[PDB]
Amino acid sequence: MNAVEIISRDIYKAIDIQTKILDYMTKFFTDRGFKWLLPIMLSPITDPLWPDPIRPAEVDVYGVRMRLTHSMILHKQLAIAMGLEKIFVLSPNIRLESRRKDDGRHSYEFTQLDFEIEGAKMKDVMRLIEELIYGLFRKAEEWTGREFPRARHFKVYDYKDILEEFGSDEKASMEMEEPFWIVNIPREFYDREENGVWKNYDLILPYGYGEVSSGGEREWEYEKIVAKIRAAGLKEDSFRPYLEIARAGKLKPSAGAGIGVERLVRFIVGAKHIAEVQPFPRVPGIPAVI
Amino acid sequence: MNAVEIISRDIYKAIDIQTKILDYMTKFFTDRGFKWLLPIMLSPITDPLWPDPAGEGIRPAEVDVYGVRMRLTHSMILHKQLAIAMGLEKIFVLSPNIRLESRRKDDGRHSYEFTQLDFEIEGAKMKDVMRLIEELIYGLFRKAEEWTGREFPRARHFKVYDYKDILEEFGSDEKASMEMEEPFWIVNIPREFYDREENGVWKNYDLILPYGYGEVSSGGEREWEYEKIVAKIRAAGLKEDSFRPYLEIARAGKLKPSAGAGIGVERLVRFIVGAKHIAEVQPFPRVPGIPAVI
Ligand SMILES: Nc1ncnc2c1ncn2[C@@H]1O[C@H](COP(=O)(O)O)[C@@H](O)[C@H]1O
Ligand SMILES: Nc1ncnc2c1ncn2[C@@H]1O[C@H](COP(=O)(O)O)[C@@H](O)[C@H]1O
Ligand SMILES: [Mg+2]
User: Is the C-beta atom of A214 inside 6 A of ligand 1?
Assistant: First the structure.
């Protein structure tokens, strides 16, 4: 698609739905006393996205190598350390994944509504996301006149049982008709692990649409954080100012999640490919024309 | 300042105010039938920010994506015009920008990363946009009195000055802001190719805050005609090559007359909390010429 073809697509209904979704979700959080933060796109530190079942793009800023935002996870933990209590942000992310990830669900630029709550536990956040999704689905039925999944609470699968029964979260999505949780997934250092149990969670949409939200409780203790980083083969100086805050003992227990906005729009409009809900497509492996 | 000093600052009140401002502004637009778009951060093309009397001529930060040069968003102006070309009629976006301005721009009003609420309206004229901004600002200031218990400028509409006359009377827009006690408009400012120019008159506008706080909003009617646009690019010494896909759209006759503006969120927060320096309202400061530690 050249530039003219890109702007010649019909996208009005998807954008109409997107506007209603953003209105609903931002209000959901401000109604519950969340602070609305603005994003950052450049920092000496960012989410490594590893280990996880790709290097961040970099640019020089006044002589210092900065990373483009993979995700604001570390900055959300810092906002909690500043005592903001409950926060969310509409955060753009840049993830330059390969052509292989062009599966209809991935974009190399996207936005997630990313939130964090001081002191929250995994079951708190999951219940909160269930409340958000249930309400959103009921409204979407009014917006679109179509029927959406009806459950107030979603089945919870352990990561292991998903690999056991379906082989992958992929096959799982295709087989289900309700959103479902996958919990206890070994991954990045910031996610809390206790007694071999990872206190984290992914919300998977039915009908093959795949993951829509992901989060967890956080590690906040210096020794434990550095251990997981070293163990993973990550370099500590990639996270220096963060670890300095951790060493100072200023990180606080918290839990949160990110919700992929375009993935949600795609589900509600029922679009075959995520690019169809984006005015300026950002397809993995295909550098954007505009 | 270092990481621990940053996280130790007390900015709860500014963030509480920011939350109320974002709630108010986004509702203002959706209430009026505007569509809410998500931002783009990388693109082959971006706002040149030049010519522009308010800038020094910075080049966008660049990064390769699958081997192809992309520019980090200076502003989404060209993308707003393309959204209008897609028939979305009335649009807004909370758009983060990256502008690596020099230390000379560290005047308390600039940050090298910031967000603007950027909006565009198909068919609108400068008077329509200016009046909509007045409606938004007046209503915001009335709410701010309740949020803070302090007094804010009460004007329902703001006075209008030509740029040329500002220079003559005050010497600069900075001096003008220091002398005024209510917000005011500066219009007819020769600048970038996308602002509409007709027989020597630029159809554009900056909202300036009083008490030295400076500019908080800027916009204009747009050019949409290929030959007019190309001539302005060439006259400024810019390169058609830098705007190739946009110029393809323009050559095809698919740009439409429109007008819009951007409103600096952090600048507005700063004004309402009375902060000396914009860094005081940002959880992670981005001070011009100083690479941030976090
Ligand atoms: N490449 C991508 N394209 C579109 N959406 C994404 C992408 N990666 C993540 N998301 C969304 O953002 C959410 C948070 O992702 P994460 O930061 O990876 O845990 C996911 O649950 C998805 O909804
Ligand atoms: N460097 C900056 N730091 C903070 N806010 C800015 C900066 N540049 C522009 N703004 C705000 O964004 C609005 C739109 O800017 P512009 O795209 O330059 O017309 C301005 O009116 C300011 O309120
Ligand atoms: Mg300007």
Answer: yes
